[PDB]
Amino acid sequence: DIRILMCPPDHYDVDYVINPWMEGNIHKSSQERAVEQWKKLHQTIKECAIVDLVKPAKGWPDMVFTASAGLVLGENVVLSRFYHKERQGEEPYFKAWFEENGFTVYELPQDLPFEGAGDALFDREGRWLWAGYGFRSELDSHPYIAKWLDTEVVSLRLIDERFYHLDTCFCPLSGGYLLYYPPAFDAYSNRVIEMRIPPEKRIIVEELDAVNFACNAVNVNDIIIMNLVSRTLKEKLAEAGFKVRETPLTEFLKAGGAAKCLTLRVTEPILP
C-alpha cells in the first residue's frame, strides 16, 4: 500500500542553471548513463514499494524530479507552483497525472511559489508537516498548506543556496529519526528542530556527506536508499536500525537532485 511516483529520463539533460549544482554542467550529463542510473534506482525502490510512472514531457528535463510535483496527503494534493519558469511547464503534466489517478488537487495563486514534497516533508508519525522556505517555496504558502491539508506546519528557513530544497538537507525517517544537515538552517530553525526531535533521534550529517546528497534519501520502513555516503554515516544508520542501499546518481547530481528528488510518495496516510 506504499506507492511512489517516478518519471523516466527520456528527455533528461541539464539545459539551464537554476541552482548552484547546475553551474558549469549544461549538457554535461550523459543521457545513456542517466537512464542506467535511473533504472537501477527504480529497481531498488520497486523492491520496497510499488512504483507508478508519469510520462515525461520533452522540453522539461527536470520532470524526472517528481518530488516537486506536489505535496500529497490522503486523497489530496497541493500542486507545486514552481519558482522558475524553466520548471513551470511541468505543472500541467503533473496536474493531469494527479487528476487521472483520483486525487483532489489544490492550486496556489500563480504568484505564490511552493515546490511540493521537495520543500515539505511530513513527520513520519503524521504529527505535523515540516516545510522549508527561503529559496523556492514562499513562507506565505505555508498557511495555505496548513488549512488545505489540516495539518500543523513547522516552517524551517533554508540559508545555503546549495541546499535550496528541504529534501536536500532534511529527511524524516521511520522510528522517529531525522537525518539532516544543521548548517542548511538558520539558528531559530535549528532550535525548532531540536525542540521536537531529541538528540538520540537525530542523525546528523557532516558536510562531506551533505554535498553528496546524503539527506536526499528514500526511506521505506527500515530501508534507506541514497546515492553514496560515508561509512561513518552508514554505521550510524545501521545502529538506528536502517538497511542502507546505495546506488549511483551522478548524472542527476549534475542537476542538483538525487534519490529522494526522483521520487514522490503518493500514499501518505492520514494518521490518528
mmCIF file of C-alpha atoms in Angstrom:
data_model
loop_
_atom_site.group_PDB
_atom_site.id
_atom_site.type_symbol
_atom_site.label_atom_id
_atom_site.label_comp_id
_atom_site.label_asym_id
_atom_site.label_seq_id
_atom_site.Cartn_x
_atom_site.Cartn_y
_atom_site.Cartn_z
ATOM 1 C CA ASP A 1 0.000 0.000 0.000
ATOM 2 C CA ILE A 2 3.084 2.207 -0.400
ATOM 3 C CA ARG A 3 3.273 3.730 -3.878
ATOM 4 C CA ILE A 4 5.961 6.041 -5.253
ATOM 5 C CA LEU A 5 5.720 8.175 -8.394
ATOM 6 C CA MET A 6 8.749 8.430 -10.697
ATOM 7 C CA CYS A 7 9.331 9.822 -14.193
ATOM 8 C CA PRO A 8 11.932 8.320 -16.553
ATOM 9 C CA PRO A 9 14.780 10.353 -18.068
ATOM 10 C CA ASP A 10 13.702 10.013 -21.711
ATOM 11 C CA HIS A 11 14.234 13.762 -22.211
ATOM 12 C CA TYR A 12 16.726 14.409 -19.425
ATOM 13 C CA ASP A 13 19.531 16.939 -19.841
ATOM 14 C CA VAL A 14 20.983 19.899 -18.000
ATOM 15 C CA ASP A 15 19.716 22.820 -20.097
ATOM 16 C CA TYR A 16 19.722 25.754 -17.669
ATOM 17 C CA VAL A 17 21.075 26.892 -14.306
ATOM 18 C CA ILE A 18 18.520 27.325 -11.516
ATOM 19 C CA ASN A 19 20.569 26.020 -8.592
ATOM 20 C CA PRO A 20 24.311 26.069 -7.836
ATOM 21 C CA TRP A 21 24.878 22.412 -8.725
ATOM 22 C CA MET A 22 23.860 23.103 -12.319
ATOM 23 C CA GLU A 23 26.530 25.771 -12.861
ATOM 24 C CA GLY A 24 29.058 24.559 -15.402
ATOM 25 C CA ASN A 25 27.001 21.409 -16.037
ATOM 26 C CA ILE A 26 24.903 22.402 -19.048
ATOM 27 C CA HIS A 27 24.988 19.448 -21.464
ATOM 28 C CA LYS A 28 27.453 17.609 -19.202
ATOM 29 C CA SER A 29 25.024 14.797 -18.379
ATOM 30 C CA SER A 30 25.170 11.531 -20.309
ATOM 31 C CA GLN A 31 21.577 10.604 -21.139
ATOM 32 C CA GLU A 32 22.531 6.931 -21.524
ATOM 33 C CA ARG A 33 24.282 6.847 -18.146
ATOM 34 C CA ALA A 34 21.339 8.722 -16.633
ATOM 35 C CA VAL A 35 18.997 6.042 -17.985
ATOM 36 C CA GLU A 36 21.144 3.312 -16.432
ATOM 37 C CA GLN A 37 21.337 5.087 -13.060
ATOM 38 C CA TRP A 38 17.618 5.791 -13.018
ATOM 39 C CA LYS A 39 16.791 2.180 -13.909
ATOM 40 C CA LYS A 40 18.945 0.907 -11.046
ATOM 41 C CA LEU A 41 17.227 3.310 -8.646
ATOM 42 C CA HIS A 42 13.797 2.334 -9.970
ATOM 43 C CA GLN A 43 14.560 -1.357 -9.460
ATOM 44 C CA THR A 44 15.845 -0.747 -5.938
ATOM 45 C CA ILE A 45 12.774 1.281 -4.978
ATOM 46 C CA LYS A 46 10.426 -1.231 -6.587
ATOM 47 C CA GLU A 47 11.815 -3.961 -4.336
ATOM 48 C CA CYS A 48 10.385 -1.905 -1.431
ATOM 49 C CA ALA A 49 7.288 -0.182 -2.854
ATOM 50 C CA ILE A 50 5.013 -0.073 -5.874
ATOM 51 C CA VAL A 51 6.316 2.432 -8.436
ATOM 52 C CA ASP A 52 3.936 4.383 -10.662
ATOM 53 C CA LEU A 53 5.279 6.345 -13.629
ATOM 54 C CA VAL A 54 4.238 9.601 -15.278
ATOM 55 C CA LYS A 55 5.213 10.079 -18.919
ATOM 56 C CA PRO A 56 7.953 12.716 -19.311
ATOM 57 C CA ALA A 57 7.427 15.807 -21.448
ATOM 58 C CA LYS A 58 10.041 16.865 -23.984
ATOM 59 C CA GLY A 59 11.480 20.265 -23.145
ATOM 60 C CA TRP A 60 11.038 19.880 -19.360
ATOM 61 C CA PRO A 61 14.124 17.880 -18.383
ATOM 62 C CA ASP A 62 13.630 18.353 -14.636
ATOM 63 C CA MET A 63 10.337 16.441 -14.770
ATOM 64 C CA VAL A 64 12.363 13.420 -13.616
ATOM 65 C CA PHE A 65 12.389 15.137 -10.208
ATOM 66 C CA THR A 66 8.872 14.158 -9.200
ATOM 67 C CA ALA A 67 9.379 15.147 -5.553
ATOM 68 C CA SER A 68 8.412 18.657 -6.637
ATOM 69 C CA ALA A 69 5.252 17.649 -8.477
ATOM 70 C CA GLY A 70 3.205 18.443 -5.377
ATOM 71 C CA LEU A 71 2.561 17.645 -1.734
ATOM 72 C CA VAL A 72 0.304 14.624 -1.097
ATOM 73 C CA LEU A 73 -1.760 13.781 1.980
ATOM 74 C CA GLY A 74 -4.527 11.214 1.752
ATOM 75 C CA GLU A 75 -6.556 11.801 -1.393
ATOM 76 C CA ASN A 76 -5.442 15.448 -1.606
ATOM 77 C CA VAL A 77 -2.507 17.093 -3.361
ATOM 78 C CA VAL A 78 -1.274 20.666 -3.224
ATOM 79 C CA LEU A 79 0.142 21.142 -6.705
ATOM 80 C CA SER A 80 3.524 22.794 -6.893
ATOM 81 C CA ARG A 81 3.855 26.267 -8.341
ATOM 82 C CA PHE A 82 7.488 26.420 -9.375
ATOM 83 C CA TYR A 83 9.649 29.419 -8.619
ATOM 84 C CA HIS A 84 11.397 29.238 -12.015
ATOM 85 C CA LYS A 85 9.732 29.480 -15.417
ATOM 86 C CA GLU A 86 12.083 26.679 -16.517
ATOM 87 C CA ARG A 87 10.020 24.196 -14.475
ATOM 88 C CA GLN A 88 6.580 25.848 -14.584
ATOM 89 C CA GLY A 89 5.740 23.985 -17.796
ATOM 90 C CA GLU A 90 5.791 20.717 -15.832
ATOM 91 C CA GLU A 91 2.748 21.815 -13.817
ATOM 92 C CA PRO A 92 0.019 20.824 -16.343
ATOM 93 C CA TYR A 93 1.532 17.367 -16.822
ATOM 94 C CA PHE A 94 1.756 16.677 -13.085
ATOM 95 C CA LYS A 95 -1.754 18.066 -12.590
ATOM 96 C CA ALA A 96 -3.067 15.726 -15.276
ATOM 97 C CA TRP A 97 -1.397 12.754 -13.582
ATOM 98 C CA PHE A 98 -2.888 13.610 -10.191
ATOM 99 C CA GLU A 99 -6.375 14.083 -11.647
ATOM 100 C CA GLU A 100 -6.193 10.878 -13.717
ATOM 101 C CA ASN A 101 -5.187 8.923 -10.601
ATOM 102 C CA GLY A 102 -8.063 10.129 -8.443
ATOM 103 C CA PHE A 103 -6.535 12.900 -6.334
ATOM 104 C CA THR A 104 -8.306 16.141 -5.446
ATOM 105 C CA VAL A 105 -5.949 18.966 -6.411
ATOM 106 C CA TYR A 106 -5.453 22.302 -4.633
ATOM 107 C CA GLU A 107 -3.746 25.080 -6.600
ATOM 108 C CA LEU A 108 -1.901 28.059 -5.184
ATOM 109 C CA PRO A 109 -2.119 31.575 -6.594
ATOM 110 C CA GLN A 110 0.141 31.875 -9.633
ATOM 111 C CA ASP A 111 2.401 34.369 -7.820
ATOM 112 C CA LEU A 112 2.973 32.160 -4.748
ATOM 113 C CA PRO A 113 5.735 29.567 -5.248
ATOM 114 C CA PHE A 114 5.716 26.229 -3.464
ATOM 115 C CA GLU A 115 7.674 23.182 -4.588
ATOM 116 C CA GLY A 116 5.838 20.243 -3.127
ATOM 117 C CA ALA A 117 7.482 17.377 -1.292
ATOM 118 C CA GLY A 118 10.813 18.799 -2.419
ATOM 119 C CA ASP A 119 10.210 21.509 0.161
ATOM 120 C CA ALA A 120 7.759 19.911 2.610
ATOM 121 C CA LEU A 121 8.049 16.539 4.335
ATOM 122 C CA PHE A 122 5.757 15.001 6.918
ATOM 123 C CA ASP A 123 6.950 13.741 10.239
ATOM 124 C CA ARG A 124 6.590 10.013 9.687
ATOM 125 C CA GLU A 125 4.085 9.571 12.541
ATOM 126 C CA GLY A 126 1.970 12.309 10.945
ATOM 127 C CA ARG A 127 2.280 14.677 13.897
ATOM 128 C CA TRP A 128 2.983 17.710 11.654
ATOM 129 C CA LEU A 129 4.449 18.786 8.324
ATOM 130 C CA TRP A 130 7.952 20.220 8.169
ATOM 131 C CA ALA A 131 8.037 22.881 5.458
ATOM 132 C CA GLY A 132 11.079 24.644 4.109
ATOM 133 C CA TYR A 133 11.285 28.133 2.707
ATOM 134 C CA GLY A 134 13.948 30.582 1.637
ATOM 135 C CA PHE A 135 14.857 29.692 -1.945
ATOM 136 C CA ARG A 136 11.938 28.060 -3.750
ATOM 137 C CA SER A 137 8.795 27.951 -1.612
ATOM 138 C CA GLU A 138 7.454 31.174 -0.139
ATOM 139 C CA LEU A 139 6.784 31.325 3.604
ATOM 140 C CA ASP A 140 3.343 32.754 2.768
ATOM 141 C CA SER A 141 2.404 29.442 1.126
ATOM 142 C CA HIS A 142 2.612 27.612 4.451
ATOM 143 C CA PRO A 143 -0.756 28.786 5.873
ATOM 144 C CA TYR A 144 -2.487 27.648 2.666
ATOM 145 C CA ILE A 145 -0.978 24.192 3.094
ATOM 146 C CA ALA A 146 -1.857 24.103 6.784
ATOM 147 C CA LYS A 147 -5.505 24.785 6.019
ATOM 148 C CA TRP A 148 -5.854 22.738 2.856
ATOM 149 C CA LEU A 149 -4.354 19.638 4.439
ATOM 150 C CA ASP A 150 -5.499 20.242 8.058
ATOM 151 C CA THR A 151 -2.000 19.849 9.450
ATOM 152 C CA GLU A 152 0.276 21.818 11.696
ATOM 153 C CA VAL A 153 3.100 23.237 9.594
ATOM 154 C CA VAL A 154 6.520 23.729 11.180
ATOM 155 C CA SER A 155 8.335 26.235 8.976
ATOM 156 C CA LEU A 156 12.111 25.921 8.571
ATOM 157 C CA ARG A 157 14.291 28.568 6.912
ATOM 158 C CA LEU A 158 16.974 27.418 4.478
ATOM 159 C CA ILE A 159 20.081 29.622 4.340
ATOM 160 C CA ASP A 160 22.531 27.839 1.957
ATOM 161 C CA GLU A 161 21.836 28.079 -1.764
ATOM 162 C CA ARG A 162 23.318 24.602 -2.263
ATOM 163 C CA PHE A 163 20.560 23.207 -0.024
ATOM 164 C CA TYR A 164 17.751 25.047 -1.741
ATOM 165 C CA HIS A 165 15.061 22.353 -1.237
ATOM 166 C CA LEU A 166 14.218 20.950 2.187
ATOM 167 C CA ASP A 167 14.708 17.406 0.899
ATOM 168 C CA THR A 168 18.360 18.037 0.040
ATOM 169 C CA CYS A 169 19.274 18.621 3.695
ATOM 170 C CA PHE A 170 16.469 17.108 5.796
ATOM 171 C CA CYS A 171 14.825 13.677 5.777
ATOM 172 C CA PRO A 172 12.262 12.448 8.307
ATOM 173 C CA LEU A 173 12.636 8.693 8.797
ATOM 174 C CA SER A 174 10.678 5.901 10.397
ATOM 175 C CA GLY A 175 11.102 5.253 14.100
ATOM 176 C CA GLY A 176 11.118 8.953 14.977
ATOM 177 C CA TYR A 177 14.557 9.536 13.439
ATOM 178 C CA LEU A 178 15.576 12.618 11.472
ATOM 179 C CA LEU A 179 18.513 12.641 9.046
ATOM 180 C CA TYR A 180 19.605 16.229 8.455
ATOM 181 C CA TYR A 181 22.382 18.787 7.891
ATOM 182 C CA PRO A 182 22.049 21.535 10.565
ATOM 183 C CA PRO A 183 24.147 24.201 8.733
ATOM 184 C CA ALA A 184 21.484 24.371 5.996
ATOM 185 C CA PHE A 185 19.150 26.025 8.531
ATOM 186 C CA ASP A 186 19.276 29.266 10.483
ATOM 187 C CA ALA A 187 19.690 29.262 14.251
ATOM 188 C CA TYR A 188 15.995 29.679 15.038
ATOM 189 C CA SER A 189 15.077 26.828 12.686
ATOM 190 C CA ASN A 190 17.690 24.566 14.268
ATOM 191 C CA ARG A 191 16.190 25.359 17.666
ATOM 192 C CA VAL A 192 12.717 24.496 16.339
ATOM 193 C CA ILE A 193 14.005 21.141 15.047
ATOM 194 C CA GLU A 194 15.796 20.427 18.344
ATOM 195 C CA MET A 195 12.710 21.211 20.430
ATOM 196 C CA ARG A 196 10.786 18.473 18.621
ATOM 197 C CA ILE A 197 13.400 15.790 17.881
ATOM 198 C CA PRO A 198 15.570 14.791 20.866
ATOM 199 C CA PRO A 199 19.303 14.157 20.352
ATOM 200 C CA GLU A 200 19.073 10.353 20.318
ATOM 201 C CA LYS A 201 16.729 10.575 17.291
ATOM 202 C CA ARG A 202 18.953 12.985 15.322
ATOM 203 C CA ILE A 203 21.209 11.524 12.630
ATOM 204 C CA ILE A 204 23.437 14.498 11.901
ATOM 205 C CA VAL A 205 25.210 14.539 8.553
ATOM 206 C CA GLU A 206 28.575 16.231 8.069
ATOM 207 C CA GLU A 207 29.312 18.430 5.069
ATOM 208 C CA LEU A 208 31.182 15.715 3.179
ATOM 209 C CA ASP A 209 28.052 13.552 3.098
ATOM 210 C CA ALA A 210 25.695 16.525 2.665
ATOM 211 C CA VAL A 211 27.382 17.613 -0.584
ATOM 212 C CA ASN A 212 26.903 14.098 -1.941
ATOM 213 C CA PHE A 213 23.158 14.425 -1.267
ATOM 214 C CA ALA A 214 23.121 12.003 1.677
ATOM 215 C CA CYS A 215 19.989 13.655 3.066
ATOM 216 C CA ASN A 216 18.180 13.234 -0.273
ATOM 217 C CA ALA A 217 17.307 9.697 0.755
ATOM 218 C CA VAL A 218 14.299 7.465 0.085
ATOM 219 C CA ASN A 219 13.071 5.656 3.182
ATOM 220 C CA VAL A 220 10.536 2.838 3.144
ATOM 221 C CA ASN A 221 10.153 1.210 6.518
ATOM 222 C CA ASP A 222 13.700 0.229 7.570
ATOM 223 C CA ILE A 223 15.266 0.612 4.133
ATOM 224 C CA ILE A 224 17.067 3.795 3.140
ATOM 225 C CA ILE A 225 18.183 4.343 -0.456
ATOM 226 C CA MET A 226 20.725 7.032 -1.291
ATOM 227 C CA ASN A 227 23.379 7.956 -3.862
ATOM 228 C CA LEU A 228 26.631 7.353 -1.941
ATOM 229 C CA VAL A 229 27.671 8.042 1.602
ATOM 230 C CA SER A 230 30.461 7.592 4.108
ATOM 231 C CA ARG A 231 30.980 4.503 6.205
ATOM 232 C CA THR A 232 30.565 6.785 9.219
ATOM 233 C CA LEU A 233 27.009 7.666 8.222
ATOM 234 C CA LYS A 234 26.213 4.111 7.126
ATOM 235 C CA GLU A 235 27.221 2.848 10.567
ATOM 236 C CA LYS A 236 25.102 5.490 12.311
ATOM 237 C CA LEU A 237 22.115 4.456 10.201
ATOM 238 C CA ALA A 238 22.733 0.753 10.847
ATOM 239 C CA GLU A 239 22.880 1.399 14.594
ATOM 240 C CA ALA A 240 19.496 3.144 14.330
ATOM 241 C CA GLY A 241 18.067 0.056 12.610
ATOM 242 C CA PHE A 242 18.196 1.051 8.933
ATOM 243 C CA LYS A 243 19.405 -1.027 5.986
ATOM 244 C CA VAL A 244 21.278 1.266 3.597
ATOM 245 C CA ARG A 245 21.203 0.700 -0.163
ATOM 246 C CA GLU A 246 23.465 2.906 -2.280
ATOM 247 C CA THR A 247 23.005 3.443 -5.979
ATOM 248 C CA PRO A 248 24.977 5.807 -8.234
ATOM 249 C CA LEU A 249 23.181 9.003 -9.259
ATOM 250 C CA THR A 250 25.989 11.277 -10.501
ATOM 251 C CA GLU A 251 24.120 12.253 -13.669
ATOM 252 C CA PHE A 252 21.276 13.652 -11.542
ATOM 253 C CA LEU A 253 23.563 15.437 -9.095
ATOM 254 C CA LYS A 254 24.638 17.479 -12.132
ATOM 255 C CA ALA A 255 21.097 18.933 -11.975
ATOM 256 C CA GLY A 256 21.140 19.312 -8.192
ATOM 257 C CA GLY A 257 18.995 16.284 -7.300
ATOM 258 C CA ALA A 258 19.391 12.706 -6.107
ATOM 259 C CA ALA A 259 17.387 9.678 -4.979
ATOM 260 C CA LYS A 260 14.638 11.420 -2.999
ATOM 261 C CA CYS A 261 14.207 14.163 -5.615
ATOM 262 C CA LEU A 262 13.456 11.452 -8.204
ATOM 263 C CA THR A 263 10.522 10.150 -6.119
ATOM 264 C CA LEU A 264 7.193 11.248 -4.695
ATOM 265 C CA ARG A 265 5.378 9.065 -2.190
ATOM 266 C CA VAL A 266 1.759 9.232 -3.357
ATOM 267 C CA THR A 267 0.360 7.129 -0.487
ATOM 268 C CA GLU A 268 0.591 9.361 2.592
ATOM 269 C CA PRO A 269 -1.950 8.031 5.103
ATOM 270 C CA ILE A 270 -3.868 10.339 7.384
ATOM 271 C CA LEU A 271 -2.870 9.080 10.833
ATOM 272 C CA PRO A 272 -4.762 9.486 14.159
#
